[PDB]
Design a protein around this nucleic acid. Structure first.
Length: 137
RNA sequence: UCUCUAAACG
């Protein structure tokens, strides 16, 4: 198999406030045409860019938030709904609680990234900056 | 509550 591709396919949100990207009910799984109905299960996590030591640049900005598919991204070895700090788990009725082998080992670096967007274009948390809801007034 | 990475003004 190819190695674990570890990064998010999608656009990442940036913090304005201080409270974590905590959804109601487990409802917050994004849309992506190049994915099946079984695929639609995943988690949100933080990216403080705050360095434990070595191999990264302090930049002082607010933090970011990334999504991953189930059994993919940095927490790829957790099952669904696991009890770890700064992970927010999300699922659809229609998804399967299996890890995503192809989606978790293939190469995102091949193109542009996928716009993070909810079903119906449901407006993401006011605490955060997304690619939608641009321009005024 | 909680440290994680490629610049932000939904």
């Amino acid at each position: 198999g190819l190695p674990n591709n570890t990064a998010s396919w999608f656009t990442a949100l940036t913090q304005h406030g201080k409270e974590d990207l905590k959804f109601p009910r487990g409802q917050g799984v994004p849309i992506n045409t190049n994915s099946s109905p079984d695929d639609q299960i995943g988690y949100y996590r933080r990216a403080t860019r705050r360095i434990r030591g070595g191999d990264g640049k302090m930049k002082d900005l607010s933090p970011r938030w990334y999504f991953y598919y189930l059994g993919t991204g940095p927490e790829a070895g957790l099952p669904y709904g696991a009890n770890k700090d700064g992970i927010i788990w999300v699922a659809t009725e229609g998804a399967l609680n299996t890890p995503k082998d192809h989606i978790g080992t293939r190469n995102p670096a091949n193109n542009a990234a996928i716009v993070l967007q909810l079903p119906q274009g449901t407006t993401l948390p006011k605490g955060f900056y997304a690619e939608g809801s641009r321009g005024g007034s």
